[model samples]
Target: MGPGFDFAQAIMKKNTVIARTEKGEFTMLGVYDRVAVIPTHASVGEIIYINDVETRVLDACALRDLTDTNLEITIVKLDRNQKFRDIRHFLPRCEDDYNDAVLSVHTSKFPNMYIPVGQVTNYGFLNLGGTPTHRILMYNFPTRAGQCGGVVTTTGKVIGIHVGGNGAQGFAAMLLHSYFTD
Candidate 1:
């Protein structure tokens, strides 16, 4: 249903992080030290728990939508004490590196559990008319309510962040390379 235990363990240990807010708990990807990327829909509070350690959200910014394709991502800054290791590998590095098979790492309703492998069916814009249009990776998976903001990966390279979707399909926000620039 998902990745092997060893692969999952490696990802959880190094890249994935649990974010707890007043609303609830979700997952965040550790792209750099003291910084993580989350979905804009996952409302963040002034003070949130990063891996159970209370920290302030030093900064949070959403990507600009020039083409009206809203990229639902929020880059947040955390205290130096709460450090998340840098992602060793990343997606869109080269044309061939982008694989359709991907895994989503996130905390389930039950603590310390994550969903498994899902295949990317499409890479396109999600336009719901009145609602914001998002550039997303459409995947074949049914995610839970709390699984928003989960990290999407393929071949150990961090790729996208799960935002939302219907029962049969899921949508992950395509991670922008510019987001990593300090």
Candidate 2:
């Protein structure tokens, strides 16, 4: 988490809605419906409640990345394109295979207020499953009990999809390269 209110204010503005697992057992914020899910980890049938309407996931697929072979990350697609209150300008495509830079993720751990989670330490590629996967490496990013799938962004353009955290690190599926349709 970064210091002061300015960061928090900005993140909250970009933050999207929550994606809830089946049975609502788990929840993750920063569901980027405004952008393509070509490199996301969203699951099928999960609920995001975009636009105050409970939306259902139509599909989710793994993105082809050199650094990640675990195939844990996936692109998420909704039943339909639904706009929401928090998002104004959807993030644009990155159009790159790899990039390393400091950024932040908007999380629901802070609730209706979007919480900025970082000045990410080493935002770069790592070998996961013999693949050069794009990832955001950081520590102590705030989160809820079941919150994962936060949107990681630079300025306002999305760079990665927050998956989960390790001992002292957070991992987000970096957007290096996709097209999604229904």
lDDT tens readout by residue for model 2, 1-182:
33334433455465544444432322233334544342233344555555346776665566655644443466565665554233324334443332232333333443443345545555555554344565444535544334455555555455555555654566666544333322
Model 1, residue 44: displacement in angstroms? 1.8
The TM-score of candidate 1 is 0.81
On residues 1-182, what C-alpha lDDT tens digit does candidate 1 reach at each position?
A: 44444454566678777888776777877777877878776677678887688888888877657774667888888764756666644545422224445545556464555555445645666753245655677777776577787766665566677788778777777776666865
Worst 10 residues of 2 by lDDT: 98-107
The models' CA-based lDDT, in order, is 0.67, 0.46
Best by lDDT: 1
Top TM-score model = 1
Model 2 steric clash pairs: 12-114, 40-74, 66-131, 66-132, 67-131, 67-132, 67-133
